[PDB]
Amino acid sequence: TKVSLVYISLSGNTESFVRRLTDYLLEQHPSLEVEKIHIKDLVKERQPFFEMDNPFIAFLPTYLEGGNGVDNGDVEILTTDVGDFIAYGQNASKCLGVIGSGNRNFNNQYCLTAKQYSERFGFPVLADFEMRGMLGDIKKVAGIIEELYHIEK
Numbered sequence: 586t587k588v589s590l591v592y593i594s595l596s597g598n599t600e601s602f603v604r605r606l607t608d609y610l611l612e613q614h615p616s617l618e619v620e621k622i623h624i625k626d627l628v629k630e631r632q633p634f635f636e637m638d639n640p641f642i643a644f645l646p647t648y649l650e651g652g653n654g655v656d657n658g659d660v661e662i663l664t665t666d667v668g669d670f671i672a673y674g675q676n677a678s679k680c681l682g683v684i685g686s687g688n689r690n691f692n693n694q695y696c697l698t699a700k701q702y703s704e705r706f707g708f709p710v711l712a713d714f715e716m717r718g719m720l721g722d723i724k725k726v727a728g729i730i731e732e733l734y735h736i737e738k
């Protein structure tokens with residue numbers, strides 16, 4: 586069994602979480618295969634999108650136009666390449682769910698993009714965390730991953 590973590594990180598918060606989550610998973614399951622796919626790196630290095638051969642979890646930080654933007658400023662910015670990757674071929678049917686990263690000071694817009702992705706593609710929001718996330722978030726997401734990939738505890 587292989588764990589696939591598809592993410593984007595613009596200021597490093599989600600990148601940090603994915604790194605620490607992977608370290609935690611390997612500490613608990615030394616032989617586990619964990620694949621990280623950074624969408625930003627695929628785009629910048631001018632690599633094409635592809636179809637996943639393995640079920641995966643999406644990690645999506647929240648960036649919205651805000652201000653006096655159309656539809657209460659709830660238009661996604663900067664992260665749309667993640668949506669494109671999921672919308673590619675049959676990737677949506679391969680997505681186990683989305684995990685949102687955000688800032689509680691954004692009140693009702695806290696992790697809104699994850700819910701938008703969930704509503705569009707039909708997979709659930711598995712969890713949300715604030716900024717880099719805490720140990721409690723690491724452990725929770727690790728548990729969800731163990732359940733979803735049927736990993737022995």
Ligand SMILES: Cc1cc2nc3c(=O)[nH]c(=O)nc-3n(C[C@H](O)[C@H](O)[C@H](O)COP(=O)(O)O)c2cc1C
Pocket residue numbers: 593594595596597598599600646647648649686687688689691694695696697715716717
């Ligand atoms: C321009 C801008 C807009 C943001 N809008 C939201 C938002 O609407 N809701 C939210 O929960 N967090 C919002 N955030 C906070 C980020 O989602 C949060 O800092 C996240 O951890 C960023 O992850 P990253 O470092 O991997 O890019 C915003 C941050 C910036 C810089």
